[model samples]
Target: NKDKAYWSAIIRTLVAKEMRVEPETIDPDQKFTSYGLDSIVALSVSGDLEDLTKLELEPTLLWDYPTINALAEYLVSELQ
Candidate 1:
């Protein structure tokens, strides 16, 4: 049942929450590093994503996808 939009929202919310900013400030096209997502934060966020999606995601998932749009697309494909 998960789709691109669903994952996008989740990723955006997670990133925004971790960065302590409003989700509205997150740009889907922007690189995670641009938002100050360090290795520690990325690991934490990916863990949260794994819990939410019930999927076995790699620790480097954030670096591999590198953006909310890319991550959502990848997650949608995995769900399918």
Candidate 2:
């Protein structure tokens, strides 16, 4: 659970920086699509995560998880 929360905050901070918004404005429950992110940005985020975690993430990883909470949970389960 601590790892999940930590990753969730990491994802939220990364995403918020990319989107030029406050991290608090990013809702963990909201879809990435709701933030107006297209495939290119989504792919970039996945690539960043891959580099950060040293994991081979799926191409459609962003679509599959789609939110900070979901992505963090998945990463925690798989990586931690």
Candidate 3:
């Protein structure tokens, strides 16, 4: 519970940073594109997660889990 929640917030922050938005406004279920996350933000987050997890994260990771909670599950199962 605590683990994913912690990183979920972190992911929100990262995504927000790349999107140039406020993290507090991020809704995990919402599309990143809805908030205007272009290719740069998407690619940036893939790089960030790879650096943060130190795992060989897939380049298409955003397709697997396009939201914070879904991504948190992937992290828990794949990296944790």
Native-referenced Cα lDDT, model 1:
0.89
Q: Per-residue lDDT for 23-76 in model 3, tens only? A: 888898886667777676778887898888787776467766877778777888
Q: Which candidate is the best by lDDT?
A: 1
lDDT of 2 by residue, 5-38 (tens): 9999988987887788999988988999998777
- The weakest ten consecutive residues by lDDT in model 3 span 55-64
Winner by lDDT between candidate 3 and candidate 1: 1
The models' CA-based lDDT, in order, is: 0.89, 0.85, 0.77
**Which of 1 and 2 is the better model by lDDT?**
1
Measured with C-alpha atoms, the lDDT of residue 12 in candidate 1 is 93
Runs off by more than 4 Å, candidate 3: none
Models sorted by lDDT, best on top: 1, 2, 3
Candidate 1 lDDT over residue span 1-80, tens digit each = 56899889989998898899999999998999987889888888888988988998875988899999999999999889
TM-score of each: 0.93, 0.89, 0.84
